[PDB]
Symmetry: C2
Subunit: 152 residues, 2 copies
């Protein structure tokens, strides 16, 4: 197998119409995080776990329409209540690791709601062609977060 690595930094800024503590709870509470992050559609998360603390972990394993395992695992490094979450994570398709990332999620109250900046520093492995999927997936994820906050 030919080994290679491609690095990138992705940044997404969102302005949510919700108070900062409520936005943060959407990340800290397993029931909430599962709902918006792991349940992407009429298809519920079948295999989700969260231990939300520095030194903690998160897991979401999903079989796609074609039976391919998308295995997400994260390890929490820094958590400042209502202000910041930093975690490293990896994605595997089947048993093949396609990427590793350091994600920073920063939150701050602003007039009208919350400003959130999501930064992902990622490395894609061994010829896996991202082709913008990571940024698109993340944008849609945060769209779902916003929908979740509205439904509340």
């Amino acid at each position: 197998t030919i080994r290679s690595a491609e690095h990138a930094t992705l940044v997404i800024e969102r302005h949510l119409k919700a108070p900062i503590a409520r936005v943060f709870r959407a990340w800290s509470a397993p029931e909430a995080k599962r709902q918006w992050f792991a349940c992407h559609g009429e298809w519920q998360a079948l295999d989700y776990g969260l231990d939300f603390r520095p030194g903690g972990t998160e897991r979401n394993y999903v079989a796609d329409t074609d039976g391919l395992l998308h295995a997400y695992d994260a390890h929490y490094i820094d958590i400042v209540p209502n202000a910041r979450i930093i975690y490293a994570y990896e994605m595997k398709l089947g048993e093949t690791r396609i990427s590793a990332s350091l994600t920073t999620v920063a939150f701050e109250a602003e007039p009208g709601g919350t400003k959130m900046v999501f930064t992902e520093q990622v490395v894609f492995l061994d010829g896996y062609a991202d082709n913008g999927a990571r940024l698109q997936g993340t944008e849609i994820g945060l769209d779902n977060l916003e929908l979740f906050l509205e439904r509340e």
Copy 2:
């Protein structure tokens, strides 16, 4: 107090006059890595350990002459023998986390040695000012790696 985050990506390319398996072995063997990575001389070595596997942990704690703890903790993610190491790590000064990083170390054989590319994607926290510390500290490490490899023969 004032929360902030500053992101950067540092890239270092070092060439070593040692073959790839031997260079890689200096990273994979705890007793080898301790010799080049866990020393300072004037500082107090407090603890070093390495569990070199995906999901494994590494620590390196040292205290400066002011009694200030410099704490390195790493979590390994991807390991391809003689080719690649990826780990995430954090640094603390005392009880204060100053950074978190994703580090990729790529190894490639070339005529008469090994090409190493060390990419660190880092976030500095809460007003901590790097100003060359990270790159310089990493190079010191690699200097010592190089010397370690020369001492082996």
